[PDB]
Write a protein that binds this DNA or RNA. Structure first.
Ligand code: MG
Ligand code: MG
Ligand code: MG
Ligand code: MG
Ligand code: MG
Ligand code: MG
Ligand code: MG
Ligand code: MG
Ligand code: MG
Ligand code: MG
Ligand code: MG
Ligand code: MG
Ligand code: MG
Ligand code: MG
Ligand code: MG
Ligand code: MG
Ligand code: MG
Ligand code: MG
Ligand code: MG
Lengths: 175, 49, 126, 52, 60
RNA sequence: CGUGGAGGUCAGUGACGAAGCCUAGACCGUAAGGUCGGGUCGAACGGCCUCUAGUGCAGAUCUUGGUGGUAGUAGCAAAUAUUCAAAUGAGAACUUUGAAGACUGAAGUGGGGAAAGGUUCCACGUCAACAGCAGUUGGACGUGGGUUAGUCGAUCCUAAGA
RNA sequence: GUCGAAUUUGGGUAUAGGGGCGAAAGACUAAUCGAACCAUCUAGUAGCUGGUUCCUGCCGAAGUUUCCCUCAGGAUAGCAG
RNA sequence: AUAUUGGCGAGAGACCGAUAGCGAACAAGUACAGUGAUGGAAAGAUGAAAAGAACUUUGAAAAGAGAGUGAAAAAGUACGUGAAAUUGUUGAAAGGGAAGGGCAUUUGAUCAGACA
């Protein structure tokens, strides 16, 4: 419980979440933002194509010194990648949300990703020995992911007496 | 037995997040190293290359 | 107010003694009052609780229920009554932890030592 | 206690060490090694003008 | 709105809803002034609470 | 003006919600600050007359703890080198078997020991953490098994010495 | 560079800090040697550097005089209450 | 008659309240470091009661979604409250080589008083 945002009329929505997942927060945020707002089946097929390296995930925020590719022209960018681990985690959550919607009885053809949110989980703190007998940090940045899918469904004016008189005079003068 | 197993698995989580080799891994790091913070480098012998 | 120099009003000392009290002291600490009928019959007001006496619950969500003391869990400062429990769907029954100051003894388990205790407290049994 | 904050083996590392000149605990193998000591502004140090 | 009967961040907790119902009962009073296991165990307690001659004088 | 504790008083506030915290709301002070509404919270707290002090922080390369940008960046390029099929498994560049290609080249990447370590040896089970990728594998995790002397050593003798 | 001896090396043993040891470089004596390491006296010594925590109102200065031989460190006069 | 930071047994405080108070409120002179003499931490709080989430379903599994226990899961052994730094999502706004501040007003949003 306690999602970042919930749906009004929860009888038309299904939710899924995953916590403390050992996967890169920045890549996962990019993947979730690529998925944000799509139809569920279209999003799943797109993620399959990303795994097949036919399409790409555009990297918009965490993208310094990234290579450029022609597969970013679909989304009007130059920097895009294919994060397989993040795609697999998001695919698992999508499948779970679809299963929950099916158990609730919602129409699978009308489901769209109405909410998806990735934030930072507590860090996994390994350490590495380095030159001159130093200890440097060597950390994993895990993610909390959550998503909500949703079924798609298809003045007194106060006037002055002068204004009232003007309106009445116009009414008398006209038809 | 399963309740005890779940209790142990819940107990392990902080050490696993700190990436310990196990319950026997109790390495301690100092706050600051004097050999790294004890330097005035004159024209002569140094402590490292 | 206290007058003796050998008694302490220190909250820390009192709580430490209570929580570290050994089993023989916890027996006296787990004392339950008698019913009106037993009070009139014997002439005493309260006794330490034991295993084979009947009780009535007079406080809490289980008020009005009766039963026999199933056990005296001195380790957790509680008593367990066979009739008073909590039930689950899977058939699980968990005993309710009751405090003897919230109970009333309706039928004492009588033996030689219990009779002697009542008599030395000032009772008039039979 | 008159010994509070004083039961520590510590010394300053000197000027020019890129760290503050507060005395620091020696030794090794514990998180205490290298921490500031003896100061009224230090965690675990001696309070200013201890009550008598 | 729930009594009358997209994505939102406005939620009502059960604790607050229960307190609201309790306080509404207080205000209404002022305005007026001015288990299967248990069943099975009960049933079990309610339900528990010449001749013949074979052979003869011989060793078969 | 504000803070911790203390004597007195308001027969002060409080489970119909104390303290704390958040706040696109309201008000009073020149100001230090004070007051009210809403949300959260779940048991204590304030006004005034006085007493008392470990009583007010932006800085001290201040102390302890926590967190950023750098940045998915630098990099994971010494030691010539890996490939195919099957099996297992949710999942195999990295595990097992087989099929191949190579290397150490007897001053070895072979076979034993001394110092040191102390169960790491071996079997069964087994992947949360660790093995800077991975992992079904492991010197990892869990449970056990294993070291047999009249003849090998110590033990005895003396050396420099104590 | 040297490579059969002023050779290389294991173990045992001896020498301990105002001391040792030194084919002598203030070399080495457990990453420490112009003085090993540990604890205490000890909150050692300040000519000096850095910092020093709420508000408002009113008043509000000082490099100019004589001196301890002159530096240093102090006295005194003036200015503000 | 006087002394008493050790030992044993007691009673108290205008003392401190988990970075404070003894180094140590907790398996603390412990863990760990050092050849050694010695040096020496961090670490308290679910709930009244473990009643610590049975059962269905998705998933290899961790877990998720329904359901349930409980006053409360805006208490799920990461557990009273749950600030800031820093972050995600949503809504609104601005942006031709910084941003922030002062005076004044326009615009958009939003709001109190006063209503006899
Ligand atoms: Mg580059
Ligand atoms: Mg090293
Ligand atoms: Mg202290
Ligand atoms: Mg309140
Ligand atoms: Mg102070
Ligand atoms: Mg500060
Ligand atoms: Mg300042
Ligand atoms: Mg600083
Ligand atoms: Mg690179
Ligand atoms: Mg190589
Ligand atoms: Mg070769
Ligand atoms: Mg060869
Ligand atoms: Mg790895
Ligand atoms: Mg092995
Ligand atoms: Mg083993
Ligand atoms: Mg040396
Ligand atoms: Mg402490
Ligand atoms: Mg909490
Ligand atoms: Mg914030």
């Amino acid at each position: 419980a306690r999602y970042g945002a919930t749906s009004t009329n929860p009888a038309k929505s299904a939710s899924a979440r995953g916590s403390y997942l050992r996967v890169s927060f920045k890549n996962t945020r990019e993947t979730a933002q690529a998925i944000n707002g799509w139809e569920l089946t279209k999003a799943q097929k797109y993620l399959e194509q990303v795994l097949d390296h036919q399409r790409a995930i555009p990297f918009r925020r965490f993208n310094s010194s990234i290579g450029r590719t022609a597969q970013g022209k679909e989304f009007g960018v130059t920097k895009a990648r294919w994060p397989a681990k993040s795609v697999k985690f998001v695919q698992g959550l999508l499948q779970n949300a679809a299963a929950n919607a099916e158990a609730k009885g919602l129409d699978a053809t009308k489901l769209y990703v109405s909410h998806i949110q990735v934030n930072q989980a507590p860090k996994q703190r390994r350490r590495t020995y380095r030159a001159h007998g130093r200890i440097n940090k060597y950390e994993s940045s895990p993610s909390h992911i959550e998503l909500v899918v949703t079924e798609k469904e298809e003045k007194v004016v106060r006037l002055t007496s002068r204004q009232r008189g003007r309106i009445a005079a116009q009414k008398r003068i006209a038809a | 037995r399963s309740k005890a197993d779940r209790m142990a698995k819940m107990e392990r989580r902080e050490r696993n997040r700190h990436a310990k080799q196990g319950e026997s891994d109790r390495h301690n790091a100092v706050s600051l190293s004097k050999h790294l913070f004890s330097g005035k480098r004159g024209v002569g012998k140094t402590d490292f290359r | 107010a206290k007058q003796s120099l050998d008694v302490s009003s220190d909250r820390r000392k009192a709580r430490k003694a209570y929580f570290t009290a050994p089993s023989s002291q916890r027996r006296v600490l787990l004392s339950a009052p008698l019913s009106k009928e037993l009070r009139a019959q014997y002439g005493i007001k309260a006794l330490p609780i034991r295993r084979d006496d009947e009780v009535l619950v007079v406080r809490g969500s289980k008020k009005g229920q009766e039963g026999k003391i199933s056990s005296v869990y001195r380790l957790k400062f509680a008593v367990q009554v066979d009739k008073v429990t909590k039930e689950k769907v899977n058939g699980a029954s968990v005993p309710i932890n009751l405090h003897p100051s919230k109970l009333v003894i309706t039928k004492l388990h009588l033996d030689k030592d219990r009779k002697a205790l009542i008599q030395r407290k000032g009772g008039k049994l039979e | 206690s008159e010994k509070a904050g004083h039961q520590t083996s510590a010394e300053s590392w000197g000027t020019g060490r890129a760290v503050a000149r507060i005395p620091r605990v020696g030794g090794g193998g514990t998180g205490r090694s290298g921490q500031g000591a003896f100061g009224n502004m230090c965690r675990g140090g001696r309070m200013f003008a201890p009550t008598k | 709105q729930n009594k009358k009967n997209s994505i939102t961040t406005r939620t009502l907790s059960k604790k607050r809803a229960k307190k609201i119902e309790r306080n509404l009962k207080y205000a209404t009073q002022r305005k007026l002034l001015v288990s299967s296991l248990t069943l099975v165990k009960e049933a079990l307690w309610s339900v528990i609470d010449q001749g013949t001659t074979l052979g003869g004088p011989f060793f078969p």
